[PDB]
Structures are given as structure tokens and as C-alpha cells.
GROMACS .gro file of C-alpha atoms in nm:
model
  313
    1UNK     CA    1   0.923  -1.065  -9.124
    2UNK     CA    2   1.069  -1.132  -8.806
    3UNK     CA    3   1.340  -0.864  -8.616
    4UNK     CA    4   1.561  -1.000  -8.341
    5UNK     CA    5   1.789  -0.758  -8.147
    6UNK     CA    6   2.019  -0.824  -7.862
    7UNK     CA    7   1.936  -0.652  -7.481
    8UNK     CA    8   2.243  -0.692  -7.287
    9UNK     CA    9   2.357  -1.011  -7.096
   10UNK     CA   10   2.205  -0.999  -6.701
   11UNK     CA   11   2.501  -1.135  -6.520
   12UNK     CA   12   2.524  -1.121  -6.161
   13UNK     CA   13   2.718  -1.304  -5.900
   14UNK     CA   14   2.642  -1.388  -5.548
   15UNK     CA   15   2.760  -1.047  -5.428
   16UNK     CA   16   2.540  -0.890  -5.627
   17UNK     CA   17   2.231  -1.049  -5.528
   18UNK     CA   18   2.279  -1.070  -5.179
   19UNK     CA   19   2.494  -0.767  -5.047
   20UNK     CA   20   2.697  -0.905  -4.828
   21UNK     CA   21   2.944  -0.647  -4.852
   22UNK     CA   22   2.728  -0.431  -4.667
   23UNK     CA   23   2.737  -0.675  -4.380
   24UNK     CA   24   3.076  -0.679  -4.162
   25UNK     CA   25   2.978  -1.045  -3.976
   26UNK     CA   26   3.012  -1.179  -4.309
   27UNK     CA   27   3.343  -1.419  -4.348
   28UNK     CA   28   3.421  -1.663  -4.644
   29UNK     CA   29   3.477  -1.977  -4.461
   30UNK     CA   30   3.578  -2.323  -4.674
   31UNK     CA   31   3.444  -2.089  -4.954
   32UNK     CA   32   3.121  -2.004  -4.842
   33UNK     CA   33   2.959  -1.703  -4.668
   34UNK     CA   34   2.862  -1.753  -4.323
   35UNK     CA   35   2.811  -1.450  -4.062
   36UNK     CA   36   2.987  -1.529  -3.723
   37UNK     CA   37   2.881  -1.255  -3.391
   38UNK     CA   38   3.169  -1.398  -3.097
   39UNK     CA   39   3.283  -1.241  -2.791
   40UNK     CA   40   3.271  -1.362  -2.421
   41UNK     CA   41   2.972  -1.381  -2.155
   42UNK     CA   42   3.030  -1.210  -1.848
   43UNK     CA   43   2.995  -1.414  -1.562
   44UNK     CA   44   2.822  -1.217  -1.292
   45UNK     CA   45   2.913  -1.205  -0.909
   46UNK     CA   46   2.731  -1.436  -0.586
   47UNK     CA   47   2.506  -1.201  -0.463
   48UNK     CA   48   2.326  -1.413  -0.163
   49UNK     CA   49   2.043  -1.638  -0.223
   50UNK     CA   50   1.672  -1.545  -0.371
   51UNK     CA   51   1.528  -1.939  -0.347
   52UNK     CA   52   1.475  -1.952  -0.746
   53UNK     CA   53   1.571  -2.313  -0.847
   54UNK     CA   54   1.799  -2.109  -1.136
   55UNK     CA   55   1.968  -1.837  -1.098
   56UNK     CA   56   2.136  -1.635  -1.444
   57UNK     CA   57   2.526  -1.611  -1.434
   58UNK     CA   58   2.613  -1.438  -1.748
   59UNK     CA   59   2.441  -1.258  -2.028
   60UNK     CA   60   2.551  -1.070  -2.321
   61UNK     CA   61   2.371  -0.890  -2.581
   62UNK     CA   62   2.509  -0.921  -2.930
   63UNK     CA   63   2.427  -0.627  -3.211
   64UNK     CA   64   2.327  -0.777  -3.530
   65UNK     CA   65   2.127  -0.465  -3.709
   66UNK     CA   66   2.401  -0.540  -4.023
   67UNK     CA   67   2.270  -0.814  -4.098
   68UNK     CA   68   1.908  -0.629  -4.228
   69UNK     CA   69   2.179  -0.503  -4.515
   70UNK     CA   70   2.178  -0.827  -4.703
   71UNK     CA   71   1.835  -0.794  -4.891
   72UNK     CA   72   1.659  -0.441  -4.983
   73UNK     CA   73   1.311  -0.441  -4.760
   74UNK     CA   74   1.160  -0.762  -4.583
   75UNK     CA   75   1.346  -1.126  -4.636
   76UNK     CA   76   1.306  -1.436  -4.452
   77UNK     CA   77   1.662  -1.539  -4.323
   78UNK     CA   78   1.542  -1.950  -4.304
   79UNK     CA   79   1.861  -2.128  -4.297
   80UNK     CA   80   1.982  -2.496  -4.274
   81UNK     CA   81   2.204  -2.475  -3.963
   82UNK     CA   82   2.253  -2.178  -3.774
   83UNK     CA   83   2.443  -2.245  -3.474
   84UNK     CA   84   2.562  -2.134  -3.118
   85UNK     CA   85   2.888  -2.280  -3.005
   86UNK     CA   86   2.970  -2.224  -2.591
   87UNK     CA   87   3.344  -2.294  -2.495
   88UNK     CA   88   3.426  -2.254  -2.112
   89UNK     CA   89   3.708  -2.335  -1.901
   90UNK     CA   90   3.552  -2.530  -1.608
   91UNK     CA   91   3.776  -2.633  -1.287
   92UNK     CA   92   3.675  -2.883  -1.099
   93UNK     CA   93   3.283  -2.880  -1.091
   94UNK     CA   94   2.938  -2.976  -1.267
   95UNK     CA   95   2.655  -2.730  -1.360
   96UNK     CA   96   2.325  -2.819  -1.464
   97UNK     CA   97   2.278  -2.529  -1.691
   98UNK     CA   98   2.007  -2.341  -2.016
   99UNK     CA   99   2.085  -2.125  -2.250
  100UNK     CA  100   1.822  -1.893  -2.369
  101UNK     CA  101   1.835  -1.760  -2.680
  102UNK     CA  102   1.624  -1.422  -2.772
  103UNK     CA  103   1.630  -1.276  -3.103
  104UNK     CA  104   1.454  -0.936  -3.171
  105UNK     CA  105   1.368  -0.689  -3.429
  106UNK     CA  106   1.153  -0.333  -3.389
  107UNK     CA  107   0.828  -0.582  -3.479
  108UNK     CA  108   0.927  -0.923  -3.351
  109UNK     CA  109   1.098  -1.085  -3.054
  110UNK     CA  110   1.123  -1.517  -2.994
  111UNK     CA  111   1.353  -1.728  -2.794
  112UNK     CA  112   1.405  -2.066  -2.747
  113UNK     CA  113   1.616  -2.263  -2.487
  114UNK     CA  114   1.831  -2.539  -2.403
  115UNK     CA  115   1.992  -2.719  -2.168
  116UNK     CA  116   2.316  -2.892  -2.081
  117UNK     CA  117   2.572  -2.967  -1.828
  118UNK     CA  118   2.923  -2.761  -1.812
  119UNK     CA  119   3.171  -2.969  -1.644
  120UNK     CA  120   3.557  -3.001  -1.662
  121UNK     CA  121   3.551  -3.386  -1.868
  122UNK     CA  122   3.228  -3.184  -2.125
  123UNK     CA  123   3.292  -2.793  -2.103
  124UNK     CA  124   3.219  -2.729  -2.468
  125UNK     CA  125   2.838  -2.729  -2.590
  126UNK     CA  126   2.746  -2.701  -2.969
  127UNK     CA  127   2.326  -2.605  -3.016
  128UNK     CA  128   2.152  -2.636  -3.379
  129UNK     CA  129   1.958  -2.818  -3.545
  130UNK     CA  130   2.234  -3.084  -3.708
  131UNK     CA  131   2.512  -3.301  -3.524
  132UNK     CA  132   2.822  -3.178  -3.602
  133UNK     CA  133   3.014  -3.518  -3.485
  134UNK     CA  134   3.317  -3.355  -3.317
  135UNK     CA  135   3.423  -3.501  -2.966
  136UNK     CA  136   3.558  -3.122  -2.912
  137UNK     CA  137   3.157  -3.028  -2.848
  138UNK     CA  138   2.887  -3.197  -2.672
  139UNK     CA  139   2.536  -3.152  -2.902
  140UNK     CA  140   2.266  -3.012  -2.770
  141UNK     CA  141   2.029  -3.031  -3.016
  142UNK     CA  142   1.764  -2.760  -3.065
  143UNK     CA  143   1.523  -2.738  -3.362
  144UNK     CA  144   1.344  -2.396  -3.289
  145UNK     CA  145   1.679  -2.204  -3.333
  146UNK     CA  146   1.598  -2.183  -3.760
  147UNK     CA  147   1.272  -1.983  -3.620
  148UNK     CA  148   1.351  -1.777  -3.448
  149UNK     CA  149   1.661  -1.664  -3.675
  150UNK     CA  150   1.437  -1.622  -3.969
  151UNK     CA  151   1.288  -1.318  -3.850
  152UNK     CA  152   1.621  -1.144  -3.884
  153UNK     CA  153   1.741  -0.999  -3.594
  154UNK     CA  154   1.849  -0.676  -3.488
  155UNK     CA  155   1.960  -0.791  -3.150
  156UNK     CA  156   2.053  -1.160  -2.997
  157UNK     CA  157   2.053  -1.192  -2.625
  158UNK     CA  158   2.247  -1.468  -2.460
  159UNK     CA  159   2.101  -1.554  -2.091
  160UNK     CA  160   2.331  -1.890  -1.921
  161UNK     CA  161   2.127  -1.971  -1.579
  162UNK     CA  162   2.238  -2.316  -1.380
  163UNK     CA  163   2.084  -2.517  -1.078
  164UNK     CA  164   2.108  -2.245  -0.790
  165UNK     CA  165   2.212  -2.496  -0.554
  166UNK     CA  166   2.505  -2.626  -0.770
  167UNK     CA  167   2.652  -2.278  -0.830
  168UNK     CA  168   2.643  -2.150  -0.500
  169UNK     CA  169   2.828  -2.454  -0.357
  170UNK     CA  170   3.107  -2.474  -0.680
  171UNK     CA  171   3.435  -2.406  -0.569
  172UNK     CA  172   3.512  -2.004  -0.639
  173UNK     CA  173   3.747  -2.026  -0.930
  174UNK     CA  174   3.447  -2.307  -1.090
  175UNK     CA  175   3.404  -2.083  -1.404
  176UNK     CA  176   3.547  -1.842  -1.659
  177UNK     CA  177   3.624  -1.754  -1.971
  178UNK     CA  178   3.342  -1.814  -2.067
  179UNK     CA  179   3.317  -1.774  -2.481
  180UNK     CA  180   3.056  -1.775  -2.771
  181UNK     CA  181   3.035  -1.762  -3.121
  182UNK     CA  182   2.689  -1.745  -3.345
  183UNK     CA  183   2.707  -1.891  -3.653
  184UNK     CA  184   2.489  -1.801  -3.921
  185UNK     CA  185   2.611  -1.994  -4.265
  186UNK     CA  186   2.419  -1.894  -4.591
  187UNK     CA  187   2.289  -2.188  -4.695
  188UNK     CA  188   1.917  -2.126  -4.749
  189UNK     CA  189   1.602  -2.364  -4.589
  190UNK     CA  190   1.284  -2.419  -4.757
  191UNK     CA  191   1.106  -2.134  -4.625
  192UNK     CA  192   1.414  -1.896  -4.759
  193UNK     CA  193   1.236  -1.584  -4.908
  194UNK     CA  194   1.389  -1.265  -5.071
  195UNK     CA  195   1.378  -0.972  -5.290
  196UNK     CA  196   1.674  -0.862  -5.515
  197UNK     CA  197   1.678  -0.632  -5.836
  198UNK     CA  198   1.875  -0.664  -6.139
  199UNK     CA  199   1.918  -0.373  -6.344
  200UNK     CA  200   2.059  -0.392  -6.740
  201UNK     CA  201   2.095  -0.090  -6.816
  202UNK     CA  202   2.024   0.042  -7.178
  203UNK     CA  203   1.855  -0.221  -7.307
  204UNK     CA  204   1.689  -0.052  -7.543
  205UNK     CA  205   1.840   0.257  -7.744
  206UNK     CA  206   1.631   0.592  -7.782
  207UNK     CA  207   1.787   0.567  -8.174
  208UNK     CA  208   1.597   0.248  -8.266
  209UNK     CA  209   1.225   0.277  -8.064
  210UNK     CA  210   1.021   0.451  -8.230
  211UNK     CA  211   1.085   0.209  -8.520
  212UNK     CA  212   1.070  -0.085  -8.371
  213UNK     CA  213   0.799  -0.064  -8.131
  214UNK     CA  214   0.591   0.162  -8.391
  215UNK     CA  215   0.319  -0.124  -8.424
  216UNK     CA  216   0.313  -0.524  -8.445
  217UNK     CA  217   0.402  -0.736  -8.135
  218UNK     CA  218   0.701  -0.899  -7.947
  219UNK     CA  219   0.848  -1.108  -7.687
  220UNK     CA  220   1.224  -1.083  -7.479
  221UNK     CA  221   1.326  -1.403  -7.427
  222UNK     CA  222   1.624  -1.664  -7.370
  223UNK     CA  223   1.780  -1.845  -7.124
  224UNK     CA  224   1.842  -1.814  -6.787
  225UNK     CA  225   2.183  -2.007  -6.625
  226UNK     CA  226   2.191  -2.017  -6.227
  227UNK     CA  227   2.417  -2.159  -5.987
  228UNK     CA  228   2.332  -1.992  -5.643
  229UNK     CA  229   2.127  -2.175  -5.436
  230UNK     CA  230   1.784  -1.983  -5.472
  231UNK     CA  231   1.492  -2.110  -5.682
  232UNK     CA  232   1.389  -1.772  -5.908
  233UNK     CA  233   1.029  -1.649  -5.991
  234UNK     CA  234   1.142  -1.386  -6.258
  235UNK     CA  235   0.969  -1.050  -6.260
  236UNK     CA  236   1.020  -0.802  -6.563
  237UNK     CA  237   0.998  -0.387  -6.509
  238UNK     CA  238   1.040  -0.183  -6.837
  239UNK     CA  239   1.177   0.164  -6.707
  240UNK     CA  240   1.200   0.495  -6.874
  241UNK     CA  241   1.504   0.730  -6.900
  242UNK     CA  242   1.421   0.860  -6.578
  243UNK     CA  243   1.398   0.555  -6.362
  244UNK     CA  244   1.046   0.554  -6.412
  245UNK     CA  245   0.811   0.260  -6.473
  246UNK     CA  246   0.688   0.203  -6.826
  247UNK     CA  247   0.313   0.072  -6.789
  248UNK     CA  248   0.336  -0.286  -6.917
  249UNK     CA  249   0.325  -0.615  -6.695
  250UNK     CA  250   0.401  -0.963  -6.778
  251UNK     CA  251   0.324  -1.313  -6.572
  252UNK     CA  252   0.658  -1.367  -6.380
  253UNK     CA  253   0.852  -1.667  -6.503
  254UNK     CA  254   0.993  -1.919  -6.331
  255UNK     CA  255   1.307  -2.036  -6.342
  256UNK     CA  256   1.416  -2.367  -6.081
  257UNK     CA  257   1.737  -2.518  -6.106
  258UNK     CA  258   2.056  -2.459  -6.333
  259UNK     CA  259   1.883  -2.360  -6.624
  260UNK     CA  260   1.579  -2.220  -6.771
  261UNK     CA  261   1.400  -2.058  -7.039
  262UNK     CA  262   1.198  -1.725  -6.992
  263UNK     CA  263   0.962  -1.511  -7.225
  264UNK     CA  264   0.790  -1.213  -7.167
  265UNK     CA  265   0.515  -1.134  -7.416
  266UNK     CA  266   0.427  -0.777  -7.507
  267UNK     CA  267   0.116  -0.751  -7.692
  268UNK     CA  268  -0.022  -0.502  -7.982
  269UNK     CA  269  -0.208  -0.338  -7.692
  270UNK     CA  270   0.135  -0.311  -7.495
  271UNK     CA  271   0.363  -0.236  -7.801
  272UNK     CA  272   0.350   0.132  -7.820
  273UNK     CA  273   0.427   0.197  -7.480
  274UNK     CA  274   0.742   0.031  -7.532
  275UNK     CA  275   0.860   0.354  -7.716
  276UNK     CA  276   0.956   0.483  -7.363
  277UNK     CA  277   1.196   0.181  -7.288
  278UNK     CA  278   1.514   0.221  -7.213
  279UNK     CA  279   1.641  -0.016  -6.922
  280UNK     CA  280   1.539  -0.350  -6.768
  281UNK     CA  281   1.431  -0.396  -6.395
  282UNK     CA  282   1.434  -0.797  -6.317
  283UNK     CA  283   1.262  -0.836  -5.991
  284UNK     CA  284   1.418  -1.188  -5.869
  285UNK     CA  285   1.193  -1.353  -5.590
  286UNK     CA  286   1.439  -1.636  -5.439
  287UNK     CA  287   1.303  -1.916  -5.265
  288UNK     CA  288   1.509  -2.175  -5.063
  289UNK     CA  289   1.525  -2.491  -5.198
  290UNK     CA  290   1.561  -2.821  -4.939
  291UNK     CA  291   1.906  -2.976  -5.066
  292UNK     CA  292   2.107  -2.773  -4.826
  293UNK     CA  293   2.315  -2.563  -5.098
  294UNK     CA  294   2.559  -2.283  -4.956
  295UNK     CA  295   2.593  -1.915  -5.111
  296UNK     CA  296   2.932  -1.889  -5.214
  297UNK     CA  297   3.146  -1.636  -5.339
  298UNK     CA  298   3.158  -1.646  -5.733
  299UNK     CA  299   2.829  -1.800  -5.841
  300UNK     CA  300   2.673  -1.664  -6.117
  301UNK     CA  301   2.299  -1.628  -6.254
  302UNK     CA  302   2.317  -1.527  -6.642
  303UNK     CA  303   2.046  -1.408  -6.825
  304UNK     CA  304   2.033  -1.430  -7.205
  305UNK     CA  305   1.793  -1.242  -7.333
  306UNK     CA  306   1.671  -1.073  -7.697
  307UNK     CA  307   1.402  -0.922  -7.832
  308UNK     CA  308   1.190  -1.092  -8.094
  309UNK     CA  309   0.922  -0.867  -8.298
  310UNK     CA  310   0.670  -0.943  -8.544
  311UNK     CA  311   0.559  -0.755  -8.787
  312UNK     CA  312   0.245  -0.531  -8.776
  313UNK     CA  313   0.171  -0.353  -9.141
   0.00000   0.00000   0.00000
């Protein structure tokens, strides 16, 4: 005396799990999402000579509150490669120069640094964490950048200083044009961490619960497909016709890789509750994974799932 009845199919695609339509960096680039910030540094004017060994000769602060928008409440933005490119137009001179890089949020501010030389033959510098191979940049490489983006900035300040000594003596017309771009391609790092909620709505009809949940026990169950780049630790919320949670938990279930099976149990304790049911709440806790997959626009995560009852009288 078994009943099965169908839920609804969970479908989502990357867009809905990570709303990056609320976040205007955002571009589709080889068909993947990667934010981009870019502008110009504002080289600043000779004023005399403090005897610092550095001296700072642009800055620019770059507003990135959007990109808070891509996950509801707190996330950890760990990604593979996020990148600062530099691209100057140097005439005639060679600077010994750092770049400091400060992210901050309303609870947390790091920066890291690195250095490099701008000159006319090398007037291009790439900083990350991987090589990107192209003679158009010189690679500086910097493994503290992933850090100190994974807080998730509100605000990244750029700070160039060079050798005080070299800039003062450059010929006048040495530097300008001086142009940046932040890079910040979804493709989640091990320590990835984030929150999204898929809702199915009417997964249970008011016309059919008092029947089937009057007594025995049952499970929802089925597979799960996914092909976004998040490991998934599934957990199930039973709400009421008002939004409201029904008063039944479940052990989350995991689900790594492509594919995987789910069940949630609810027991002859649990069963009458049930009667309140109406839609489904998953809670998806993503995890990065370490074979450096990118988000991309159009990957889906499916989940199949009925309900199975057994009989009570």
C-alpha cells in the first residue's frame, strides 16, 4: 500500500542561484560571468620633496557595494583568479613602483601589495595569483589577492607609489594615462561559501492533505542533476500558505558532482504536521570545489523529486 505523488520539478539556472542581474559589473565574457570595475588613476602633481623613500602618485577608489547583491546575507566570494590589470603609457623613463590593494566592507578591511617596474619597453603589469602568458603584460604575481577579495568588498582602493628619487628626476611628460581594470571571474575556490533558496511553489495541494498526511509515514525523494560549479548540501523547509515554516526538520543531503540522489524522511511523529504543507523551501549551501569550474550563463541544477507514503491503518 504504497502512494507516490509528483511535487513539481526544482529547476534553476545560474541566474537564479546567484543574482547576478542585480549586479551591473557583471559581463558574460567567452561565456562566463566575470565582474570587471575599470577606469583611470589619477596621477597627482610634484609637490616638493618630504624625504620618504616612496612617494604615492595616483589613487583611485573604486565602488563595489553591487557586488553584496549576488547572494542573500553573508557569502564568501573565494575565487580562482581575480585579477588587477595596470596599462600606462610611459615615455622615456623607469619607475620602481607598488601597488597596494585595500578592500573594505562596514566589518572588514585587508590589503596586500606588489611591486613592479613601469617603463616604456614593460608599461603593462598583470597581478593574480595565475600567469596569464601574454607578452602584452608583465606578471606580477601575488597570492594574497584571493583573501582579501573573499571578504566581499564594498570599496577597493588603488594606491601606485614609486622610488621618490626616480619620479622626481623623470622627465615631466614620464607618465599618463594611466588605466585599470579589476577582474573578478566567477569561477569559485575551495573556500567558496554561499546561501541561495529555491522555492517550488505548490507542492502540495490543500485538496489532497488531509488525506494523505492523515497518519502512516513518508519520504520526498529523487534525483538531483547539477552543472554549476558549486558542491550542494541540500536543506529542506516545508512552508505553510502563508510563508510560514511548518515544524519538521530533516538531515540536509548532500549532493557533489553532476548527479545525486536525495531523501528526506518524515516520520509518524512528523506526518501530521504535514497537513499544513503547501510549498517547498530548498536551502542550497554551495561550496567551491578545487577544479577551477566557471559560472556560466545557462547551467542548470534540476531537482526531481516525489513523495512516497506508506500506509498507516
Amino acid at each position: 500500500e504504497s502512494w507516490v505523488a509528483p511535487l513539481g520539478m526544482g529547476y534553476v539556472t545560474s541566474d537564479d542561484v546567484v543574482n547576478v542581474e542585480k549586479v551591473p559589473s557583471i559581463r558574460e565574457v567567452d561565456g562566463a560571468y566575470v565582474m570587471i570595475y575599470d577606469g583611470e588613476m589619477k596621477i597627482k602633481g610634484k609637490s616638493l620633496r618630504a624625504a620618504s623613500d616612496k612617494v604615492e602618485i595616483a589613487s583611485e577608489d573604486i565602488t563595489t557595494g553591487d557586488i553584496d547583491g549576488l547572494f542573500d546575507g553573508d557569502f564568501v566570494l573565494a575565487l580562482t583568479n581575480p585579477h588587477i590589470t595596470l596599462k600606462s603609457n610611459v615615455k622615456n623613463a623607469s619607475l620602481d613602483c607598488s601597488l597596494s590593494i585595500e578592500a573594505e566592507n562596514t566589518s572588514k578591511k585587508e590589503a596586500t601589495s606588489s611591486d613592479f617596474t613601469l617603463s616604456t619597453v614593460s608599461p603593462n603589469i598583470w597581478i593574480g595569483p595565475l600567469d596569464p602568458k601574454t607578452d602584452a603584460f608583465k606578471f606580477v604575481k601575488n597570492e594574497k589577492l584571493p583573501g582579501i577579495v573573499q571578504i566581499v568588498p564594498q570599496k577597493i582602493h588603488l594606491s601606485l607609489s614609486a622610488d621618490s628619487k626616480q619620479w622626481t628626476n623623470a622627465p615631466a611628460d614620464a607618465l599618463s594615462e594611466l588605466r585599470y581594470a579589476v577582474e573578478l571571474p566567477l569561477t569559485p575556490a575551495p573556500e567558496f561559501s554561499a546561501v541561495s533558496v529555491e522555492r517550488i511553489e505548490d507542492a502540495f495541494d490543500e485538496d489532497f492533505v488531509d488525506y494523505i498526511f492523515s497518519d502512516g509515514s513518508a519520504r520526498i525523494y529523487g534525483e538531483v542533476t547539477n552543472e554549476m560549479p558549486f558542491d550542494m548540501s541540500i536543506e529542506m523547509v516545508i512552508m505553510d500558505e502563508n510563508n510560514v515554516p511548518v515544524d519538521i526538520q530533516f538531515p540536509a543531503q548532500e549532493v557533489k558532482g553532476q548527479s545525486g540522489e536525495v531523501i528526506f524522511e518524515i516520520t509518524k511523529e512528523d506526518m501530521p504536521k504535514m497537513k499544513d504543507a503547501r510549498h517547498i523551501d530548498l536551502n542550497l549551501h554551495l561550496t567551491g570545489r578545487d577544479q577551477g569550474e566557471a559560472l556560466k550563463k545557462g547551467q542548470k541544477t534540476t531537482f526531481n523529486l516525489k513523495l512516497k507514503k506508506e500506509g498507516g491503518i
